[PDB]
Scaffold this active site. Structure first.
Site, PDB file in Angstrom:
ATOM      1  N   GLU A 182       0.762  -1.318  -0.118  1.00 12.18           N
ATOM      2  CA  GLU A 182       0.011  -0.100  -0.020  1.00 12.18           C
ATOM      3  C   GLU A 182       0.744   1.147  -0.114  1.00 12.18           C
ATOM      4  O   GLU A 182       0.478   2.070  -0.596  1.00 12.18           O
ATOM      5  CB  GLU A 182      -1.046   0.072   1.333  1.00 12.18           C
ATOM      6  CG  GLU A 182      -2.250   1.060   0.972  1.00 12.18           C
ATOM      7  CD  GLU A 182      -3.391   0.255   0.035  1.00 12.18           C
ATOM      8  OE1 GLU A 182      -3.902  -0.821   0.729  1.00 12.18           O
ATOM      9  OE2 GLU A 182      -3.521   0.826  -1.089  1.00 12.18           O
ATOM     10  N   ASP A 214      -5.907  13.699  -0.884  1.00 14.06           N
ATOM     11  CA  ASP A 214      -5.855  13.387  -2.443  1.00 14.06           C
ATOM     12  C   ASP A 214      -6.847  14.035  -3.468  1.00 14.06           C
ATOM     13  O   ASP A 214      -7.243  14.959  -3.011  1.00 14.06           O
ATOM     14  CB  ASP A 214      -6.410  11.807  -2.480  1.00 14.06           C
ATOM     15  CG  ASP A 214      -7.909  11.791  -2.227  1.00 14.06           C
ATOM     16  OD1 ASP A 214      -8.558  12.613  -1.692  1.00 14.06           O
ATOM     17  OD2 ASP A 214      -8.288  10.634  -2.391  1.00 14.06           O
TER      18      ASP A 214
END
Length: 164
Positions: A11, A20
């Site tokens: 990850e 994000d």
């Protein structure tokens, strides 16, 4: 080797708060802090979670702590899950690491859908399962992660992660 390291690899680890494209505030190993806005709000949460007044940067030990929290939550849910529990329950520590990893990637439900593969796993049909699983869309989309994990289910060792 350990699951945190496995996930670190699969990850990724972020030591500084990140936002994000869809507006989420995350840190560490996918540790969601906050969806919309407030970086300060995000930082506030952070500060409380680790019990320290950061400037937005944390240490690896700190990430490891949030992660461990996240791993438990996931395991809780795995247990309250009927298609998942018997597998988990029957798996070895390493192999569960793999199970958890998948959950982290696709959610319990997502995982819960590999009926056949799960079955082999529970009946200890490792190569079976491994082959079954490689024929999947998951594998085609995130092949490198898919392969390690699968290989992990196969050997029950951490070698996929030591030989990069």
């Amino acid at each position: 080797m350990n699951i945190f390291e496995m996930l670190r690899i699969d990850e990724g680890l972020r030591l500084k708060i990140y936002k994000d494209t869809e507006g989420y505030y995350t840190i560490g190993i996918g540790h969601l802090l906050a969806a919309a806005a407030d970086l300060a709000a995000a930082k506030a949460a952070l500060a409380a979670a680790i019990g320290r007044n950061t400037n937005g940067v944390i240490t690896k030990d700190e990430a490891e702590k949030l992660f461990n929290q996240d791993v438990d939550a996931a395991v809780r849910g795995i247990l309250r899950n009927a298609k998942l529990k018997p597998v988990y329950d029957s798996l070895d520590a390493v192999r569960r690491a793999a199970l958890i990893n998948m959950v982290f990637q696709m959610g319990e439900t997502g995982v819960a859908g590999f009926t056949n593969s799960l079955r082999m796993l529970q009946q200890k049909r490792w190569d079976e399962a491994a082959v079954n699983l490689a024929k999947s869309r998951w594998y085609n989309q995130t092949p490198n992660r898919a392969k390690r994990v699968i290989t992990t289910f196969r050997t029950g060792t951490w070698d996929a992660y030591k030989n990069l």
